[PDB]
């Protein structure tokens, strides 16, 4: 697995592969690892499938539940804290096998400079968290390779579409080294999924733009 998050001038992009493995045996080829938690938050999740899906599903409910009750969405700080608590609330389980680590990406509609309202928060098996402020972050079996490729390719980030290609390229680089990550399947037509967040909200990046972007990378490296 590799989930990756980028900060660009407008906002943020998060994208993750769709491999699901069990041993060294491919058991999934179309997993949706990146979720739109609310209007301005995307959350990606790595590790134990059953927990990952449940984290996302549950988290989303929590956020929208606060909103319906208090009448206002949580602060971004609030949103972070809740996710962190949830992660710590799993440390017991994690210790036994049921490990699952989230990556948070969001646009803070209350940041001073609306061109730096993009946020990337990484999470700690124990419920710790660091607001990244370095533009890029990854989680998962291949996050090491992504981060390192994404290190070099980061200067090229100019805008949404610009960042998105670097994202997909890192995930391509991850799959190239981490047999548990899984690159683009042309033979089957399956491609990494992504989400973009700017002042207007969070939107699922259509696979068209991704599939295209992917073939670009494949050709140029080919």
């Amino acid at each position: 697995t590799t989930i990756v998050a980028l900060k660009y001038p407008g906002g943020v992009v998060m994208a993750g592969d769709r491999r699901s493995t069990q041993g060294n045996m491919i058991s999934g080829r179309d997993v949706r690892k990146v979720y739109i938690t609310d209007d301005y938050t995307a959350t990606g999740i790595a590790g134990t499938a059953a927990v990952a899906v449940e984290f996302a599903r549950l988290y989303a409910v929590e956020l929208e539940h606060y909103e319906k009750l208090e009448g206002v969405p949580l602060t971004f700080a609030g949103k972070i804290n809740r996710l962190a608590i949830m992660v710590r609330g799993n440390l017991a389980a994690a210790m036994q096998g049921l490990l699952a680590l989230p990556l948070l990406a969001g646009y803070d509609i209350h940041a001073s400079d609306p061109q730096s309202a993009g946020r990337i928060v990484s999470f700690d098996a124990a419920g710790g968290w660091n607001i990244e402020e370095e533009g890029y972050q990854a989680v998962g079996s291949g996050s090491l390779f992504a981060k390192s490729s994404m290190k070099k390719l980061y200067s090229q980030v100019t805008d949404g579409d610009s960042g998105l290609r670097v994202a997909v390229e890192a995930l391509y680089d991850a799959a190239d080294d981490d047999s548990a990550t899984g690159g683009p399947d042309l033979v089957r037509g399956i491609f990494p999924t992504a989400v973009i967040i700017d002042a207007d909200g969070a939107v699922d990046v259509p696979e068209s733009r991704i599939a295209e972007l992917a073939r670009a990378i494949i050709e140029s490296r080919s």
Binding site: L58, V61, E64, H65, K68, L69
Partner: protein, 220 residues
């Protein structure tokens, strides 16, 4: 005097509802319209519950806001236990009838409230918007066109028995509403308005703010 006792409870509650302000909900082209007179900027009488279901109440605030919270709590849990699509607001009407029913018996003083739970078909789907009224004593009924509650209802409900345009417009039903409201009494852009917009993809709720509201509001 068990029987006479229940009569006093009913009385106490029913008076409280009278002295409270008025709230109205009605079915229109786009879904369901919520209109209530509310001078307060923050203390709201109309709220979202779940995706396609909505809440509105007249009476003692602290009491109905409590029930409101409970509803949101019930729906959100129910949704997570099964699926989002399994919450009905027909359900919530039950829950409310159950709760208010208990309260009218167990609690020292009965709740001085009257509730309205409204549902409007999921996005693609087309279904006749539904309205439920739950009274203080736990009684529950479903009007097919409009629901009135709080203060003197007769003049407000009567005005609607005629002015109700079956398939009105958002701006037309709002006009019909605020007018019908004035009948039991003013009615300026200093009140509370929200809709269940059946055309919305997921969360079928929307508050109508100040400036946007005027562009729809009725001349008195």
């Amino acid at each position: 005097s068990p029987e006479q006792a229940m009569r006093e409870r009913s009385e106490l509650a029913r008076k409280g509802i009278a002295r409270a302000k008025s709230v109205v909900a009605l079915a229109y082209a786009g879904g369901v319209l919520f209109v209530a007179e509310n001078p307060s900027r923050s203390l709201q009488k109309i709220s979202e519950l779940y995706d396609r279901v909505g809440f509105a109440a007249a009476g003692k605030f602290n009491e109905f806001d409590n029930l409101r919270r409970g509803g949101i709590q019930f729906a959100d849990t129910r949704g997570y236990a099964y699926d989002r699509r399994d919450v009905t607001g027909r359900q919530l009407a039950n829950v409310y009838a159950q709760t208010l029913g208990t309260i009218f018996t167990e609690q020292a003083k009965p709740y001085e409230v009257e509730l309205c739970v409204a549902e409007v078909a999921h996005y693609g789907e087309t279904k006749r918007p539904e309205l439920y009224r739950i009274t203080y004593d736990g009684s529950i009924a479903d009007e097919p066109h409009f629901v009135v509650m709080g203060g003197t209802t007769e003049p407000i409900a009567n005005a609607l028995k005629e002015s109700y345009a079956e398939n009105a417009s958002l701006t037309d039903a709002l006009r019909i509403a605020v007018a019908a409201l004035r009948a039991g009494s003013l009615g300026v852009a200093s009140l509370e308005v929200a809709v269940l917009d059946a055309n919305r993809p997921r969360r079928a709720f929307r508050r109508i703010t100040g400036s946007a509201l005027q562009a729809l509001l009725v001349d008195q």
